[PDB]
């Protein structure tokens, strides 16, 4: 079974989820984290997703070196300024120095854009819309914690070019839809669409938009993904350009965009459906959607008949297959039942189902859910549809009570004083903000100095999250931001962050 | 158009393919190349295929982290003194040196082994069958071949630990089997199974199966794919035990194999099957097998006969689609049709699909095989039957004639005078072999005078070693043919 409870240590209950599911393995070294397979399913399912969404918007896969040469890592100013002390150096080979040390991809847009622009020299090769997935290194100063918060990761980033800007900022909000719809309809998660602040925007871009997450039981938020454009910055000191039908002679920089999603989206699946009983994995994203077990198996029961209970289940297995339901058959004779409710709950299976030999011959079976552990004894012939519609339920439930905990957990507030109650409650706050970078650090030093949190919590002050593009109320004309030093320029979500 | 020729510099012609192919870009760090999509499609459906039978077999994919630790690398010892030069360490975090060095992955086997351990507490815990699908760093000192040897590639690696030996050892074979289907069955070359030397072998291992692939063009030989029984070399050292069923207070070590396959793959496709025209695909790996291509389009056409042809095109793209056969329909208004004629004959698209208002309007339309050159006029009707002919008519013409330049340039030999001749002469030749690594560095610097390197003692070699015959060097008898020659 699960010891921790969630509600009151988080951390070694994430600890010992991800760990009894048999999703994380920890390494030797610091941040980095084994994913055993089946957290690496939950990857898989939503690559098969993301992969087929950006295919149709014209994206095709690739694969670039994981190596960065000096020079073209410094390419653009702001941008290696914010990644220099996270990158990862090789120095040496064996035991030989290296004559210049390469770096390890922090992110792959200084080795793209040169190559980018060998690609382009007339307009016919824009756009370029190239996708990759792959792994890189940030050596972050900041606290390690497996899904959400790793020295190497794995994730996508896609790298678009176009000859105007309409073409760019259309594929942005493409692609965090995108991003919305793996957290919504796949992990059963809202999130809150956004524009991050000019302190918290990608460094080299012109703006960067992103989808917020909640995870309720630390009353923190999380960025489940982000989709920059870069406008013209990158394009200017790569030299990405061509010439313009319509502007004779003259150098046209190409606009350009990145966006990126990561292995953080199981970890805040984790976080939000996970309960006391272990994991909880959304049907859309399961492994096994249905675990079959053979109850009863006594020593009374003839080898004959012992044979017929295991014809049953893979009877059960091939139907369920015939419609699509990612169903395996337990049928491992090494290991008791009540070992097997236990395993497959901790995983996070949907739903149990159980034959046993009086269910078998009153053609009927035992559905289990999941996530609120309701027993249905089921009639033999609507397993198809008895089971898909469960399976339904499961998700729609997921989504709705995280839905749920979501708007009564994001308020407003105008007022410095009614932001730092509402915040030591375990909430985010959407506030009037001026949009300044000072006044964004204030908050931060602020809303940590004037913190009352529960006894042993430690030290935290709010950060921004995004500025929603459809927030919880307009802003009255002449409103003041919370700092009643500048006119505030839009209502920005606030909060505690991961 | 590429202006170099396979048979006179094959190494720019090579270099030609890959970049006007749009396989390849070239990057700032020497030995790393750049996968553009048309390349990373045949990696796709080499990995949709071997994912597929791997699954069948038990096996499920992970992903371990590619940092290991001095200790972890250091743990077997054999293993890291084979690969201690070609290992990338990472001392830096910026500009604060780290308090230990880290290592890239040149392989993970100390990286997941030590979670084997963990893992494996009971007879209940075996077998354990991962895979994944990862870059890999191994940096190499001699000059880098985009595909054939770079200092970072894909692969799969593969990672088994069995409880009794004959497990692991009917699993070696299963793998080396489906590194050949994907050599034969998906790239129509041939391979030769076999077994590496005592010098050649992997370090940390009792045996290597490999599968050897050869290049008509230059003589040189190459290894596909590798499938290593580690037996317990690794789990004496990294403490994979598990209690003795039988016997109480008795530990067995696990045995272990690993199993990989890197993109060289599509290299040596380039190699074998591109012409002086560019890339060949072999229909079961293209990306795209058809493009459809609209000609005739003058200046004078009418918009509606323009329209009409545009619509045809479209109409086989939807029949063929239909039997599920991957088509495009190159309709772009910017490129001639000349032009698009020689720009998907150096991608290697197998067929090519020419429909004119003349063609259109008598109910028919061209195909234009990429292997042969060959131009049929087909009827609209016997579209997707005689296509699909033609598709499989390609796969199998590419597979014949790479086994046969296989047969005429493996040959058997029998002294050391002989062996010299056969391998100056662009062919790699099976000889009687003493197996001994001292015969195996000799062998090496003499008939370079470049040489020749142990390649794998085949499965099933071309004669029957007679009893009594000697190895080519004369001091020690040979114990099998082994096949050597030049290789990358
Ligand atoms: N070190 C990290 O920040 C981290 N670690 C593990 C997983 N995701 C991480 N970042 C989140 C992230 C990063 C780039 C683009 C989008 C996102 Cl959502
Ligand atoms: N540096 C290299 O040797 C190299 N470079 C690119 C591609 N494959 C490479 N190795 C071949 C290889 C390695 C492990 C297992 C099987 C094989 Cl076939
Ligand atoms: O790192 C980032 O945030 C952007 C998005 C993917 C590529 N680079
Ligand atoms: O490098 C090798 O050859 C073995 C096989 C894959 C993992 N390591
Ligand atoms: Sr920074
Ligand atoms: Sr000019
Ligand atoms: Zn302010
Ligand atoms: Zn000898």
């Not at 706050?429 to 001026?434: G, K, N, R």
Request: proline share 5%.
């Amino acid at each position: 079974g699960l010891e921790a409870k969630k509600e009151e240590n988080l951390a070694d209950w994430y600890s010992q989820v991800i760990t009894k599911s048999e999703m994380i393995e920890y390494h030797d070294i610091s941040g980095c984290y084994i994913l055993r397979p089946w957290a690496y399913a939950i990857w898989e399912a939503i690559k098969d997703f993301f992969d087929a969404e950006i295919k149709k918007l014209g994206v095709e896969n690739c694969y670039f070196p994981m190596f960065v040469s000096q020079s073209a890592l410094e390419k653009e100013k702001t941008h290696v300024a914010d990644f220099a002390p996270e990158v990862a150096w090789v120095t040496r080979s064996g035991k030989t120095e290296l004559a210049e040390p390469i770096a390890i991809r922090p992110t792959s847009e200084t080795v793209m854009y040169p190559a980018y622009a060998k690609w382009v020299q007339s307009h016919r090769d824009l756009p370029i819309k190239l996708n990759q997935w792959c792994n890189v290194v940030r050596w972050e100063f900041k606290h390690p914690q497996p899904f959400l918060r790793t020295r190497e990761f794995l994730w996508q980033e896609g790298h678009s070019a176009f000859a105007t800007m309409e073409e760019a900022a259309e594929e942005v909000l493409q692609i965090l839809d995108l991003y919305a719809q793996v957290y919504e309809e796949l992990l059963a998660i809202p999130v809150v669409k956004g524009r991050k602040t000019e302190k918290e925007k990608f460094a080299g871009g012109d703006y960067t938009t992103t989808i917020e997450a909640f995870i309720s039981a630390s009353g923190r938020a999380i960025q489940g993904g982000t989709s920059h454009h870069l406008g013209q910055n990158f394009s200017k000191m790569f030299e990405i350009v061509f010439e313009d039908p319509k502007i004779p002679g003259e150098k046209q920089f190409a606009y350009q965009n990145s966006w990126g999603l990561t292995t953080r989206t199981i970890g805040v699946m984790t976080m939000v459906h996970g309960d006391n009983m272990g994991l909880v994995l959304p049907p859309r994203v399961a492994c096994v959607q249905v675990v079959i077990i053979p109850c009863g198996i006594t020593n009374a029961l003839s080898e004959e008949d012992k044979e017929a209970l295991i014809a049953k289940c893979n009877d059960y297995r091939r139907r369920l297959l015939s419609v699509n339901i990612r169903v395996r058959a337990d049928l491992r004779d090494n290991y008791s039942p009540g070992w097997k409710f236990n395993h497959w709950e901790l995983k996070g299976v949907p739903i149990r189902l159980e034959v046993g030999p009086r269910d078998m011959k009153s053609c009927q079976f035992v559905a289990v859910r999941r996530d609120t552990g309701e027993k249905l004894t089921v009639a033999e012939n609507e397993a198809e549809t008895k089971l898909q519609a469960i399976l339904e339920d499961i998700q729609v439930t997921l989504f709705t009570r995280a839905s749920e905990d979501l708007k009564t957990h994001m308020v407003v507030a105008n007022t410095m004083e009614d932001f730092q109650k509402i915040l030591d409650s375990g909430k985010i706050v959407q506030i009037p903000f001026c949009g300044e970078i000072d006044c964004e650090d204030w908050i931060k030093k602020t809303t940590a100095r004037d913190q009352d949190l529960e006894p042993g919590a430690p030290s935290m002050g709010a950060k921004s999250l995004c500025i929603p593009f459809k927030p919880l109320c307009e802003l009255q004309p002449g409103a003041k931001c919370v700092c009643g030093k500048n006119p505030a320029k839009y209502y920005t979500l606030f909060g505690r962050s991961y």
